[PDB]
Design a protein around this ligand. Sequence first.
Ligand SMILES: *Cc1c(COP(=O)(O)O)cnc(C)c1O
Ligand SMILES: [Ca+2]
Ligand SMILES: [Cl-]
Lengths: 355, 358
Amino acid sequence: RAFNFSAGPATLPESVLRQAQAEMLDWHGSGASIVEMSHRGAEFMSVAAEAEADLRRLLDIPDDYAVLFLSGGATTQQALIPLNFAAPGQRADYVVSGHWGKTAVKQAGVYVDVNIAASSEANGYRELPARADWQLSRDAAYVHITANETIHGVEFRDVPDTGNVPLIADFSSSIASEPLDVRRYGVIYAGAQKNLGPVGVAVMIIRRDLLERSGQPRADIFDYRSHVARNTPPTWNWYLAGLVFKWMLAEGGVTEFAKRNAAKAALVYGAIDGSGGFYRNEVAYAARSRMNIPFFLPDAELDARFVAEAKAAGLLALKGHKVVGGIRASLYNAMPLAGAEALVAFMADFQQRHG
Amino acid sequence: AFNFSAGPATLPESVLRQAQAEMLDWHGSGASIVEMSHRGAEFMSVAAEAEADLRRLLDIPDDYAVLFLSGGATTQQALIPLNFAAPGQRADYVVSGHWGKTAVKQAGVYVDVNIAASSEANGYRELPARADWQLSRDAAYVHITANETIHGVEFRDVPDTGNVPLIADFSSSIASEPLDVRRYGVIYAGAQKNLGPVGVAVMIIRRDLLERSGQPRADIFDYRSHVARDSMLNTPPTWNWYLAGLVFKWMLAEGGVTEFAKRNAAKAALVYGAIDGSGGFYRNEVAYAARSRMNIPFFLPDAELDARFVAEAKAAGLLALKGHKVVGGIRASLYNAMPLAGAEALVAFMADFQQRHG
Ligand SMILES: *Cc1c(COP(=O)(O)O)cnc(C)c1O
Ligand SMILES: [Ca+2]
Ligand SMILES: [Cl-]
């Protein structure tokens, strides 16, 4: 098979893509395309309601959290979060463990007093900053973390304690990759084209008491309270997200993905750690991501040969991000265990031939 | 059947057929558009065609920027004052209907909105004379709604705003006829109306306006950064950009905006002809110079006959003709994808309905 290890867009389940193609002119036999459905018609309202109900069941989202499906990606929500959940220039704490947290900080500085409570940038984002050294603010509007740093392969494995300050977490690249204890969070959000919502579908899960905050002066379209009262993806995108949620449920839910993703990552790290130094991962063991695994061969020429020979072998999109170099194997929910097995077998053969 | 919906609009059948056929096999490549990286060479080539085709379709000069954006027209109605006005600066708005009211609503927190002209107090039937507009010398821009879908009111000219740039919402009429882009500071259009349900908004910006500082704002809310990153400042909606590009190609293959000017003038002339010849049986009160070519509301002698018109038309295969809830009546939307034959079928039904009920 052709395994697609792209960090973005994530590989989508074949059956989901096949279904979306097959009924694109004839949804459920109705004779009309999902693309041309009115958002307010009975047909699409059922699609949207099933998408929300299925996501709530997948992640065990309580009724006292709101669920939003949104356009504009994670970066738009990184601007809207301080505008909705902080007073103007109120302090907000950010923990920076990689590129996507830096981006979240960049959007928010205009609107809130952004405090870097901790950062691993000085060591090149090779670890999580130790919780003991975090410098949290008593009056912070929230503490923002990036659950899984997609470029740097750095992942939280424990929900940090932030006292009585709500925790806000960017789960773009790991949402629904394992059980998520929603009640521990003030806000969980995820951009599109990573682990959960496909093209054009960002997700936000919001503890409802946070909607009682004034926030900052803002247009209605930038007010989450107005979104919850009644900037949603196109219908076909929302329908595609709903198909993904149904697929995840059919596969066994987050109980199954926890086991599958742990197994995929253990195989790849095992292949790295047992390679006698030919493959090298530089992330602290306690922070090693299950979802995005960066590693390096002895030089960049071998890195390039690996990407090209892997591509020829049906293993796609393995070149690391520019700001890191090397190789990056992404192992999202729709990547089967067989794909990690195929990568590990290729890694063994490649080393036998070039090492 | 013919679908007269004001939104979402009828998509050309050929566009949906092509999109379905190559969903998993774009250009014979075996690759799906929905899984393409936006910075990969394949989708980069799609985005370049989409911009080139739109520039060709509307004759957009090089000193205007073209953006493809998520968030719809309402998002851009908040971003326009944040990008093109200083905090609290005067901004002039012309309200000829409900989409203008929505634009005012999004902007009021960021700029000192002045209603330079409005028809709200008479149910949006008629705008004041141009000489009675209260335009502000210090305004950051004048915002108009080119076509208002609920009341069927359209600018058939371009108002003179002096040296204050004109910003125009073309969601329901973009590419329905030639447009002299140079007469505008900003042209923008959300999806679902004359573009059809393509899932992306377009903006056309005179590049000197990007030299303005606007208001302190996140980078993701900064059109300057969107232009610098070619509408890929963050992850764009790729599939939707691709669908919009198919619509542009379809519009060019039909003969471009000169052909749609002819077709849309002919569809509207047929329907207004049926209204105007009816002896008052079909009522439309919009002054002729402001009559929309794209959304044509009219009223039967009473609401019971409006309901009979909707129902009997539906049974005749003429769909989605009920007027917006806030006005009642009938509304025939006649977007680019609606063929002349649809207007002919509607007018034949209008003649038979009046023969029977009148
Ligand atoms: C991919 C990714 C993003 C991307 O942000 P968008 O605005 O959706 O492009 C954000 N956060 C994380 C953790 C990511 O992995
Ligand atoms: Ca600040
Ligand atoms: Cl749409």
